[PDB]
Structure 1
Amino acid sequence: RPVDLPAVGRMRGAELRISAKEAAAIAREVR
């Protein structure tokens, strides 16, 4: 697998789609 790919959402081309749960999951981790 590619190393450079980030861990939050899926990547298609240059567009990175983040589901609404994942941005909530980061806000849960901060709190």
Structure 2
Amino acid sequence: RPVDLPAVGRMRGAELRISAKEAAAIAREVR
């Protein structure tokens, strides 16, 4: 499995797609 995938969202080429659910989850991990 590719090392070069960060652990957040799906990528199509260089477009890393993030949902608002994922972003709000990041905010929750901050909180």
Q: How many residues matched?
A: 31
Name the % identity. 100
Task: Map 1:15-26 onto structure 2 (within 5 A).
Answer: 15-26=15-26
- TM, length-normalised to structure 1: 0.88
Runs of 4+ aligned structure 1 residues displaced above 2 Å come to: none
- TM, length-normalised to structure 2: 0.88
Structure 2 alignment gaps of length 5 or more: none
Task: Map 1:1-31 onto structure 2 (within 5 A).
Answer: 1-31=1-31
Per the TM alignment, residue 16 of structure 1 is displaced from its structure 2 partner at its CA by 0.6
* SS of structure 2 residue aligned to 1:8: coil
Per the TM alignment, residue 4 of structure 1 is displaced from its structure 2 partner at its CA by 1.0
